[PDB]
Structure formats: C-alpha cells, structure tokens
Amino acid sequence: MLKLQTLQALICIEEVGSLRAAAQLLHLSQPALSAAIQQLEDELKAPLLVRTKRGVSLTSFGQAFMKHARLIVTESRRAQEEIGQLRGRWEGHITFAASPAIALAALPLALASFAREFPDVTVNVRDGMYPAVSPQLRDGTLDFALTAAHKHDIDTDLEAQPLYVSDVVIVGQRQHPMANATRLAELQECRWAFSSAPRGPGAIIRNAFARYGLPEPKLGLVCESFLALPGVVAHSDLLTTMPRTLYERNAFKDQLCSIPLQDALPNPTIYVLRRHDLPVTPAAAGLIRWIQHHAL
Amino acid sequence: MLKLQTLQALICIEEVGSLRAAAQLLHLSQPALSAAIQQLEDELKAPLLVRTKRGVSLTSFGQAFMKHARLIVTESRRAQEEIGQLRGRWEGHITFAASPAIALAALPLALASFAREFPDVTVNVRDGMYPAVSPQLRDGTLDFALTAAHKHDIDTDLEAQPLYVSDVVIVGQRQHPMANATRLAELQECRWAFSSAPRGPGAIIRNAFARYGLPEPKLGLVCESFLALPGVVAHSDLLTTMPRTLYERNAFKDQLCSIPLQDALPNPTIYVLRRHDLPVTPAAAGLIRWIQHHAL
Amino acid sequence: MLKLQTLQALICIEEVGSLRAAAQLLHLSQPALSAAIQQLEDELKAPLLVRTKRGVSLTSFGQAFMKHARLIVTESRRAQEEIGQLRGRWEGHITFAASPAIALAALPLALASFAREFPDVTVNVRDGMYPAVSPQLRDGTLDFALTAAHKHDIDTDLEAQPLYVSDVVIVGQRQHPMANATRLAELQECRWAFSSAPRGPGAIIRNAFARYGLPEPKLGLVCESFLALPGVVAHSDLLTTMPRTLYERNAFKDQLCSIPLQDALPNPTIYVLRRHDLPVTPAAAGLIRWIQHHAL
Amino acid sequence: MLKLQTLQALICIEEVGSLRAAAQLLHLSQPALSAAIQQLEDELKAPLLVRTKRGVSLTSFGQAFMKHARLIVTESRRAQEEIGQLRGRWEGHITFAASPAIALAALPLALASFAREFPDVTVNVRDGMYPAVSPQLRDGTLDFALTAAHKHDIDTDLEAQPLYVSDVVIVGQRQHPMANATRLAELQECRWAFSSAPRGPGAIIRNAFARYGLPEPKLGLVCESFLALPGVVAHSDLLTTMPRTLYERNAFKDQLCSIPLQDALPNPTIYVLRRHDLPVTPAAAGLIRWIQHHAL
C-alpha cells in the first residue's frame, strides 16, 4: 500500500533531479530517502527511478506514476485546507492560470477583493491557455484555468463555466498602409503576426479569412507571447488579432490603431475550466466568485 | 494504521453504519481501526463520526472529508491498475546479441533452463559484436549484448559485466604444413583469413604479430562470418584465429587442426554490455543469470 | 582541371565525337581539356580515347572507365540536389524564447532589421526563462533562448554568450507608503509579489534580503506572469522586483513608482543559450547579431 | 565542385570519429584535414560535421551526403581496378554476402577455385540476407549478395540471377516427441524456433502452416543466427525449418533428426543480387562464375 510521505518525497526528487539534493530539502538522511523510495518500488514491483550522470531520472513506470502521485498529494493538501477554511482559518493555496483579457482587466480588481476577504490564502497566478492547461488540471497542480475554449471541443472529464465574452479586433501600427480599411478582403495581401488561440496560432484570423471566402492569410510570424505582441506590431507592418482588452491596455497604444472593419469578427468565450470530479475548495470557490464579479 | 486502510474503512462505515462492522468486514482490528480514526480526527482537529443509537454517522466535517477520501481511494486503485497494466506488458520480450563462444556452448543450455522458468517470454537472439552493437544498444533496439570487448575501450554510456574468459586458437586444415609449429614467428609468412574482432577484422593476429616483434601478417582474405570460417579454412591453406568453442563445435572438425603454439595468445573477455541508465526486466536478469551459470 | 569537369567532358566527347567540340560546348579551354585528359590517362596507365578521321572514340579502357564516370557524375549531381533540398528547407525557420527586457526593447527593433535582411525566414518567438527552457533547448524544439541565468548554474550541454547586463528595480504603486525608502531593511515587513527568476519565484528579493542580513521577505502572492505583474502591483500595496525595461514599458506607468534604494540590487546577465553540439543557421546567427546590436 | 580526395577523407573521419584520429591515418596535418573539410562545407553551404565529446559526428546533411560519397569513392576505385583487369593486371577487392546453404557447400570450393585463378584479388565475405543487404548493394559497399528472395518482390533497380534452388526441412532433437510424424498437421501444437527468411523470421513455417489450412505456428523463440540455430534445437524441444544443407552440415548432427514429413515444403531460390546499373568488375564476374559452378 502507498505511503503519502513517500509520494511527496518522489515529487521532490523529480523537482530537483538528485537523491542527495532531495534529501537535503526534506531534512532526511541520504540513505533514509532511498529506504523509503526502495520501499515503494519493492512493493510496486517496478523501478521508479534510474541513476543518470546528472542524478536520477524517472523510469517509464515513474513517469506514469507521477500524474497519480501529484493528484493524490495535491488533493490531500486541498482536503486539509478546505477543512481549515470551513472552520474560518482562511489559509491554503490556490494555483490558477489566466488569459490576457482576464489578466489585464478583471484580475487586478478580483485579486485585490479576494485578498481583502481572505488575507491568509496564498495565491499563485500564471499565464495559461486551453488545451495546454489540461494535464495540470488533471493532475491537480492547477486548480482552475480562465481561458478561451470552444464549448463542444472540451474534454468530457473537464467542467467549463462561462466567465466573459471577449471582443477580437485587428490591430496594426498607427500609420499602417491599411489603417483606414473597412473590409477584411482589403487585408488579403497583408502579413500577419499569428497570435495564440485554443485551436492553435493564428486560428482566429485563419478561420475569419476562411468564412469570408478569402484565401489563407499570409503568415508573417508566430508570436505566442501576448506580452511581446503589441510592440512587435507597433514596430512593423504586421497585422494581428488581439482581445480588445489588450488593444486598450498595452505599452504601445500611441503607436497602434485598430482597423475600423465593418466585417464582423468572432467573440471568443472565456471559461473557468476545472477537472470536474475534484471538489472545489471553499477558498478557490471564493476567488472564482470575485473573478466572475469583475468580469461583467 | 496505513491511511489508505483507514480511508477505505471510513468509506465502509458510511455504507454499513458501524465502525465495528466495517472493521470485521475488512478484516481489520476493531480497536486498531478505532485508534486510527481517533488519530486522524486529532490531526484534522475535527470529528469525522458521531454516535447514534444505530451505530455511527458522518459529521458535517466527515461528509466534506469523505469527498476527498473517495477521490484518494479511487486514485490509489487507478494507480495500482495502471502500474499493473504497464508492468504486465513489461514482465514479455527480450532482444539481445551473442558472440560465437556464447552462442555455441552457453546459450543452448541457458535458453532451455530460462524457458522453463520464464515460459511466457519471447526471446529474440541475433549475432553481434562490439562496437557494431553499440548504436543499437544506445538507441534501445538491443536490450543487451554478450560480446568480447576491451575494458578501456567501452563507451561511457555502457555498463560491462564480465561473463567468460575465452581462448583464441590458431586453426588450419588438418594437413597444414605448419601444423606442428611451436612459435608464432614460424607462421610469419603464412596467409591469413582475417576473422572478426572488436578492433576490426584480423585485429587479434595483427596485434599478436606486432607484440612478438613480427611484420604485419599477410592478408589472404577477410572472413567476417564465423559460420563460414571453419569450412573456408578446411578447404584452403589459410590460417585463422577463432574462439576455442568454435574450433570444438563446427561442421568441419574432421578437416581442421589447431596449432598449439608455445607462444601465448590473448584470452578475450566476453562481457554483458548494455546502457547503464536503462532499467532491466526480471526476465532479462534471469536469462543473464542462466547464461552466467552455463558460462563456467 | 577539376576531375568532375574532365569526367563531364569525357561524357560529352562520347556523345559528340570530338574533344574540341566538347570543350567548346562546355565552355572549357580546348588545350586545358586536352592536358587534363592526358593527365588522367597517365594516372590510369591507359588511353581513354583513340583518334579517328571523324574525331575521337573511346578505347576499350575508355568504355570500361565511362561506366564509372557516369556513376560519379550522376552521384555528384544527386549530392548537390539533395544538399540543395536540405539547405533550402533550412534557409527557413527560427524558433526561440526571450525574456521581458529583451522582448520589450531589443526585439522589436531587431526583428524589423532582421526581416529586411532575411525576408524569407519564418520566426517563431515565445516567452521563456531558464531553467524551464533547458529541456526544450536540449531536445531541439527551441533553437536558442535569450534569458537571464547564472553562469555557474548553466547545463554543461549548453553554450552561453552574454547579451545584456540588466537592472532589477523594486516597484510599487505610485502612492506606496515606502516610496521614499533608502534602505532594503525599511521594506522588510512589506508584502511581495514574487516574480519569476532563474532560481525560482521571488529568488531575487529573497536572496537580496538574505545578503543584507534580513529575514525571509513576506510572501503576498506569486505572479509568474510579467504581463500581469505591473497591473497587479498598480492595484495593490504589494512590492515587486522587475527588469527596469518592464518598469519603463508597461501599461500602468502612470500608476507605478520605482523605489530607488541606496542598497544595490543585482544586475542579472541576459545570455544567448543553446546546445553547443548543435549547428546554427545563418539566419539564426543573423538574428542574434541584430539582437546584440539593439541590446546596447 | 566536389573533390575526390576530400570525399575519401570524410569517409575516413566517419570511420574513426575524430579529426585528429583521421588526420593520423591519412598522413596529414591536423589543421590540413580541417581546411579540406571546411572547403567542402563552405561550398555546399552546409555543415557536415559537429564537434562532440567523443570527437566529431555527422550532421543530418553529413549523413545524407555519405551514401553519395561512398558510391562515388567506391565507383572511382572499381573504375581503376576494372581498367587494370582489362590489361591483365588482376588486382582489387570484392566484397560480398552469402546465405547458409551457399556458405556451407558451394562457397568453400568456389573460393578455393577462385583463389587459384586470381591469387592477388582480396575477397571479403560476410553473412547477409535480402532485403537487409539492399542499401549496401545501392551504395556500392557490397558488390553482390547470394541470398534467397522472391522474384516478384525484388526492387526494380536490382538485378537477380538464379543461383541455386534450395530444400527446406523441418528439424527437431533426435528423440523429439514428434520425431516420427509424417504430416504437418501433427506439428500444430509444437513450439518453433523462427529462423530468418526474406519475408521475416519464421516466414517459411508461417506460410506453410497457412497453405495447409492450419492456424499460426506457436512461436517458441526467434533465432536470427543460423550459426546458433542447430544447437538451440538440439538442446530443446523446439522445431525449426532450415536449409537441408545446414541440416547436413552443423555441429549437432548426432543430436538432431529431420521429421520425415510427406507434406511438401517450399524450395527457396537463391539468387546473385546486384545493383543493376553498376558495371560488374572482371574479378567479381570471375568469382560469381566459380560460385555458380559449385552451386550445381
């Protein structure tokens, strides 16, 4: 039978890549760690680790086991944190990912509100997009993701609650040749910075060109970073699509202009995504409430 | 106690309404299970159970906790199932390479013994020599190789475990003019069938000629096939070198004579070679044990 | 010479029946080609050509030799075709990662200059930090990364070339109570947004607190997103550390003030990182040159 | 334009894995070799080599180029050798592969006869089977292969001249339970050592079971080595198929018995296989003649 402390030890080993390095972190004897790991291996009757030049690495069995180890350990921690919260001890951890429209508008206000109500909960926020986030939702390392997705696509073990309907605009430098264009067809020969989307880089402009009877848009470059995107566009003749929120809130506003198109563009829905069968901690539910409040 | 036993018991308690009945059903000590649940309640700082006239029920805390307990119990079973599935597939194939001395004496007896012990393993055996086998050992297409090598020349990527100290014999046709020779110098003008060796065709006789202060041996032909070698020699005036096992076990024994020089030839060490980083199946371990048993 | 010119000429001679006509057709010097064929015949110790009233024909030796000449000429063309095909595909994509200080100041000007010089290269740029980028650098999915690192900590597998010596600034909202602080000790009780760094979230401020003899800094939240960071800080009382470039170039400049301590903070070195064993395309080399040009 | 000496240098570099090690062999300055290689790379505008810990390795471009380099170099050598032979200077190299029936019966007599007629030609013989031999026929490193094949299957750029029609027998240990069987159906439950065949291991017994209306034969093990096969069978209850020539000529004859089946088994045709467009050297043609003579 598995022992929880050993699972945690294995996760630590994986994080740092050495038995000696892990033992230091866990305040344990360099052989004592091995005893525990060997116990888990002896019983599973499968090797979890292999000695490498750089320390240890997970075997195939170890890699497969890790997703289960992580969910077990993180669920055990969430169980404890939830119980504390139900007694009004508002301490625990919430780890979540957010998309650009949320991160730039709703999130600063929501985190401030959440922190006033639950001052002792530790929140970890990162960038993230569906489907990249899915494995971290499944192994319990990410508690939820606030991301665009297509309703029908989403894997069956995930739950998706609608959060915000975003607005897509097409943006170029202020003095762009096509700055005064009003129809998507007028942009056919332009070069594009393909920005990130659930269906892959450039999916929104590709699908818009498609529906309007146009050929494939000309790829200028792929820019997966929304942080870099506005500056890249500002200093070139590349066009891009971005959430209107990003168009309004970036460092290069004075150098950028949205194209005043009279062809309609899509409005991607942003969802709160989670692994459905995991019980939401009271603290996480509270943060989600504040995010919803500010996303309207 | 083990937390998973306690959690499984708690699930059973919810179902049957009695700690004592759940202990009996699960074959756990009643006082042990009682103490284990108490210890858990102390750690959680809340009771999971409340006594009724009926037996016991979950508290509000216990109902919250049980959602996590069920996830954890299910996850442990899923982990064990997945590992069982992966281990089951692992615990069915071996592919390896073997040199002639191993292939002719050790392997046949070893394979028969092995197959009695591991009736469900498919073995794939081929000829192989180092360093030819190296890229195949490294890419993982060959699990191990049983071959001569020079300790100091073996790739750092590879583990090497000694298996057999072999003999090299010089062989010619039964009536060879030099059949009675005592010294290597007496053969210095003979023509040679250069046979396969770790350092290249004819390396053994070339290196022996060199150490004994002789010129390069005269090349008659290169015969990399040990299958072909005894017959080629039986029907020519060429001398060759071969493992003593091949000399003892070939189809042309009546037509060949070794030349027992008083000048010593090397005794190549046959090793078990494989990638050190790569985990070894029980069956592969068992086969190597059987090969070792029959290589003495 | 050139033997391939001579062989191509010999092929032509067989076709047109004249050394002189073949030289004219191929734009070779007639006396040069004559001398080259003579030299070849001397090396081969046989004539390739015999004179006729018509012009020349191949000898028996020339007919044998020509079978090889045709194979060699065809093989050289096949080699050139294959290399052309492989080179053509290469002379076309770059994928790399960049840290915020690079992404915001150097990259936009560098990409514009690069694209003028290398109009047919597709560039794929993403956010990335060391050591996160390491497994992607090593498996070859990322060509290079432009990121902060500590010289002594970089994987032996990687080459590291200094690019920019960056500044770290402590930042809070415009009206922060500690905006006028002079010493790090004055901030020891503030709450921090732990930002991303090579040694982990908040490593810079944790290590600064440690060196200045202070306790651990108080964790307010972890914000791994540099896109989100300036706004999160603008709408809270948290302090953070960020590259000076990000402080100068973000959407919340009017709402933020750096705190210019008299206690020095580190100046992280931004490196070009990549696998040392792995060949670099001309375009990748050119892009790195442009990035270097704009990173001073 | 390519230079022949440099191709040879590159092949040598590939053989030994170091610039320094190659330079020694070619009697050249350690930088002089680099000059020549760099010349080839500079012009191809593609890197052929990469510095590794163990020396140099071929790039993707280098690996692709090698097959062409080898054909060019070996064809240039065959061109020269042929011209010498056409002048009655019978000097050169022949490298070829042979199957077990040929190697054990025809080959010892043919090589002896060939050596009497052409004493100064260097012959290199190895094991080999179609289709494994095909790439070595195509790149000119193997001059011909004497191997079973199915007429209709053979790749169009290869030539196949019939050499011998072999006989397949089914063999077991002398006291095998089924030693006295006369019908293939009686063997249905036996376990088989799958021996090598053009269509893959065990193809002959699988195809015989199929045609006789039987289920798949039971795989006992795969033994790709005809050298090992007879001993493996002799010391187990495995049945196998082998050429009758091998049944008659192996080290374990007294311990083996052919099963006296009255169901007909196939008779595989052994061919001389070559790359058709390569001109056969006079010396190779002479060896092929002697092999044909003894294979009747």
Domain residue ranges of chain B, discontinuous segments joined by +: 1-92, 93-165+268-296, 166-267
Q: B61 contacts in A (CB within 8 Å)?
A: 83, 86
> Measured over all CA atoms, what is the biggest interatomic distance in chain A, rounded to whole angstroms?
71
Rounded to 5°, the CA angle C260-C262-C263 comes to 105
Which residues between 202 and 221 in chain A have a beta carbon less than 8 angstroms from any beta carbon of chain C?
219, 221
How is residue C53 annotated by DSSP?
Answer: S
What does the DSSP 8-state code read for residue A239? B
Three-state secondary-structure class, residue B278:
coil
Cβ-based neighbours of B91, under 8 Å, separated by 6 or more: B281, B282, B283
C240 φ, ψ (degrees, to nearest 5): -145, 175
D260, with CB counted inside 10 A (0-12, 13-18, 19+), is exposed
Resolution for this PDB entry, in angstroms = 7.1
Return the SS3 of B100: helix
User: What does the alpha-carbon distance between residue A33 and residue A39 come to, in Å, rounded to a whole number?
Assistant: 10
Q: Nearest CB to C221: which of A104, A109, A123?
A: A123
Burial A30-49 (b: 16+ CB within 10 A, else e): eeebeebbeebbeebebbbb
Structure tokens at D227: 């050298």
Q: Tell me how far apart the alpha carbons of residues D24 and D14 are, in angstroms, rounded to a whole number.
A: 14
3-state helix, strand, coil in chain A (%, to 5): 40, 20, 35
Radius of gyration of chain A (CA): 23
Q: How far is CA B66 from CA A84, A276, B60, C177, in A?
A: 15, 17, 10, 47
Q: Which residues contact C166 (CB under 8 A, 6 or more apart)?
A: C101, C148, C243, C244, C245, C267, C268, C269, C270
- With vertex at residue D160, the alpha carbon angle to CA D158 and CA D163, rounded to the nearest 5 degrees, is 155
For the annotated binding site of B for toluene-4-sulfonate, the residues are 99, 101
Residue in this structure with the two tokens 């006729």, named with its chain if needed: C52
CB neighbour list of residue C149: distance below 8 Å, 6 or more residues apart: C130, C131, C160, C198, C269, C271, C273
Residue D229 CB neighbours (<10 A): 27
CA dist., res. A108 & res. C252, Å (int):
12
For residue C94, report the phi and psi dihedrals to the nearest 5 degrees.
-135, 135
CA end-to-end span of chain A: 49
Q: Please list, in sequence order, all residues whose beta carbon lies within 8 angstroms of the beta carbon of residue B63, skipping any fewer than 6 positions away.
A: none
H or E element, residue B77: helix B60-90
Distance CA B91, CA D192 (A): 22
- Does the beta-carbon distance from B224 to D126 stay under 8 Å? yes
Number of residues that this document lists for chain A: 296
Architecture of domain B1-92: Orthogonal Bundle (1.10)
CB-based contact B233:B173 (threshold 8 Å): yes
Angle formed at CA B141 by CA B135 and CA B142, multiple of 5 degrees: 80
Residue C182 three-state SS: coil
User: How many CA atoms does the CB half-sphere of C244 hold within 13 Å?
Assistant: 11
DSSP state of C183: S
CATH number of the C166-267 domain: 3.40.190.10
- Kindly tell me the sign of the dihedral angle through the C-alpha atoms of D139, D142, D143, D145: negative
Q: Which chains touch D (3 or more CB pairs under 8 A)?
A: B, C
Which of C79, C276, C278 lies at the smallest CB-CB distance from D68?
A: C79
If you search the block for the tokens 């179609």, which residue do you land on? D130
Selection from B47, B42, B12, B49 nearest residue B27 by Cα: B12
Contact A107, A291 (CB under 8 A): yes
- In degrees and rounded to multiples of 5, residue D227 shows phi and psi of -65, -45
Of the CA atoms within 13 Å of residue C141, those in its CB half-sphere come to 8
Owner of token pair 């930090």? C129
E strands along C174-249, which residues? 191-194, 218-223, 239-243
Cis peptide before A177 (omega within 30 of 0): no
Could you say which architecture CATH assigns to the domain D93-165+268-296?
Answer: 3-Layer(aba) Sandwich (3.40)
Positive or negative CA dihedral for C189, C192, C197, C201? positive
Exposed, middle or buried, A225 (CB in 10 Å: 0-12/13-18/19+)?
Answer: buried
**Cα–Cα distance list, D103 to A220, B215, D296 (Å):** 63, 31, 14
Q: Looking at this protein, which amino acid is placed at residue B140? A: G
At D104, the amino acid letter reads: L
CA atoms D154, D198, B136, B99: torsion sign:
negative
Reference B194, options D113, D93, D122, D101; nearest CA is D122
> Distance (Å, rounded) from C-alpha C191 to C-alpha C222?
11
Nearest one of A100, A105, A150, A156 to A130, comparing CA atoms: A150
User: Does B174 lie at the interface with A, CB-CB under 8 angstroms?
Assistant: no
Kindly state the DSSP code that residue C216 receives in the 8-state scheme.
P
Residues 51-90 in D contacting C (C-alpha not used; CB under 8 Å):
51-52, 59-61, 64-65, 68-69, 71-72, 75-76, 78-80, 82-84, 86-87
**Backbone CA torsion sign across B141, B147, B153, B157:** positive
Nearest by Cα to B198 from B134, B137, B138: B134
How far apart are alpha carbons A170 and A265 in whole angstroms? 9
Crossing angle, helix D282-294 and helix D60-86, to 10 degrees? Answer: 80
- Give residue C143's Cα distance to chain centre: 6
Tokens representing residue A20 in the block: 């000696």
Chains D and C: 3 or more CB pairs within 8 Å of each other: yes
Residue in B5, B65, B279 closest to A1 by CB? B5
Cis ω for the linkage preceding B198 (within 30 of 0): no
Work out whether strand D240-243 and strand C93-98 pair parallel, antiparallel, or are unpaired: unpaired
Helix, coil or strand: residue C200: coil
Q: Write out the two tokens for D5.
A: 């000496």
What is the rounded CA–CA span in Å between residue B165 and residue B188?
A: 27
The C-alpha atoms of residue C52 and residue A62 are separated, in whole angstroms, by 80
- Partners of C67 on chain D (C-beta within 8 Å) are 79, 82, 278-279
Q: Do chains B and A touch (3 or more CB pairs under 8 A)?
A: yes
User: CA-CA distances (angstroms) from residue C110 to A194, A224, A250, C117, C274?
Assistant: 19, 18, 20, 11, 19
Nearest to B66 by CA among B9, B21, B19: B9
Phi, psi of B105 (to 5 degrees): -120, -60
Note whether C93-165+268-296 and C166-267 share their fold: yes
In the block, tokens 């036993």 appear at: B5
Judging by beta carbons within 10 Å of its beta carbon (0-12, 13-18, 19+), is residue D197 exposed, middle or buried?
buried
The tokens describing A126, both together, are 């990162």
Alpha carbon separation from A204 to A170, A196, A207, A217, A268 (Å, rounded): 10, 9, 5, 11, 9
**What single letter denotes the amino acid at residue A272?**
V
User: Strand pairing of D191-195 and D218-223?
Assistant: parallel
Q: Tokens for A6? A: 């050993």
Tokens representing C216 are 């651990």
Bridging pattern class, strands A93-98 and A122-127? parallel
Q: How far is A283 from A277, CA to CA, in rounded Å?
A: 17
Pick the closest to residue D121 from B238, B234, B200, B219 (CA basis). B219
Tokens encoding A202: 């450039």
Q: Which amino acid is at C97?
A: A
Task: Name the amino acid, one letter, at D218.
Answer: K
DSSP category for residue C217: P
> Cis (ω within 30 of 0) for the bond into D177?
no
Tokens representing D214?
């039987």
Residue pair A137/A144 in contact (Cβ under 8 Å)? The answer is yes
Q: What amino acid occupies position C105?
A: A
Chains in contact with A, where contact means 3 or more Cβ–Cβ distances below 8 Å, are: B, C
With 0-12 / 13-18 / 19 or more C-beta atoms within 10 angstroms meaning exposed / middle / buried, residue B42 is: exposed
